[PDB]
Design a protein around this ligand. Structure first.
Ligand SMILES: [Mg+2]
Ligand SMILES: [Zn+2]
Length: 307
């Protein structure tokens, strides 16, 4: 059972799962139960699926089990605030996609894998890791007793894997820039229509980006602690790059730590602030995410100024 104090807190966008590690599997079950009913999946199947998903996140500093549940929780808060707008299969597909979105991540970006001719880059040309994370999701669903979508029809089973596949591919940041530009135009003119499937996929796509970057929408002490974990992974990539005779970008160079506040400032102005601004225009109840992002942009502007 979930403690009473958490039941109120889990609904809010700023909830930090950080302090409840032993409760993360149960928090995911509670979010699924609240989002699509107590008989959303056969409980025994769901629990085996969750533990296998947990076992398939590596012990890397950032793209680990904790990140998967953080992203899942952010999606739950979007779905709890945007009732009736999402179908039952979408609510169901999106929570699973979020838990699985970074499965079997090795702490290396697509650029490294594409630059050092890694076997995964030969198999998957673009969105290299995201195509591997989707493959890991399908392999897990196909394990004995792990098929949580057994109750669905053929038509429904193939729809949910498609919601999941597009959702996991939308977590490739390289695709975010164009997707947000198209949504921004559609909204400003008045073309945006959620009944059109292509628009829906785009709206879901940006929700996946919002969820995946939600460490920038927590209270400042949490945002700062997560950033140290992201950088430990980025700096470990840059160290391998140095060993292979390639000077890494500043963001992955541990000798360039002093550029972090300015790098953070640019990531908020170019990536995160526009993401949550566009999301807020389409889904007004998601406003707390933009407000929290703005509060952390102000904290980074304070670090650079010397406050
Ligand atoms: Mg990812
Ligand atoms: Zn992620």
């Amino acid at each position: 059972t979930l403690p009473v104090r958490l039941c109120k807190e889990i609904e809010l966008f700023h909830f930090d799962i950080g302090p409840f590690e032993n409760m993360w599997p149960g928090i995911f079950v509670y979010m699924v139960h609240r989002s699509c009913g107590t008989s959303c999946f056969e409980l025994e199947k769901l629990c085996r699926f969750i533990m296998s998903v947990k076992k398939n996140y590596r012990r890397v500093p950032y793209h680990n089990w904790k990140h998967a549940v953080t992203v899942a929780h952010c999606m739950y808060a979007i779905l709890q605030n945007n009732h009736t707008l999402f179908t039952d299969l979408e609510r169901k597909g999106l929570l699973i996609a979020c838990l699985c979105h970074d499965l079997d991540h090795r702490g290396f970006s697509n650029s490294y894998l594409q630059k050092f001719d890694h076997p995964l880059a030969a198999l998957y040309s673009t969105s290299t890791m995201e195509q591997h994370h989707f493959s890991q999701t399908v392999s897990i669903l196909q394990l004995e007793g792990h098929n949580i979508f057994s109750t669905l029809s053929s038509s429904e089973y193939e729809q949910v894997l498609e919601i999941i596949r597009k959702a996991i591919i939308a977590t490739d940041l390289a695709l975010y820039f164009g997707n947000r530009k198209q949504l921004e135009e559609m909204y400003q003119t008045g073309s945006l229509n959620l009944n059109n499937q292509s628009h829906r996929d785009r709206v879901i796509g940006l929700m996946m980006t919002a969820c995946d970057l939600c460490s920038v929408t927590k209270l400042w002490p949490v945002t700062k602690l997560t950033a140290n974990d992201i950088y430990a992974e980025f700096w470990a990539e840059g160290d391998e790059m140095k060993k292979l005779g390639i000077q890494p970008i500043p963001m992955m160079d541990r000798d360039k730590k002093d550029e972090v506040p300015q790098g953070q400032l640019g990531f908020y102005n170019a990536v995160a602030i526009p993401c949550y601004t566009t999301l807020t225009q389409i889904l007004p109840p998601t406003e707390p995410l933009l407000k929290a992002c703005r509060d952390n942009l102000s904290q980074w502007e304070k670090v650079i100024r010397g406050e």
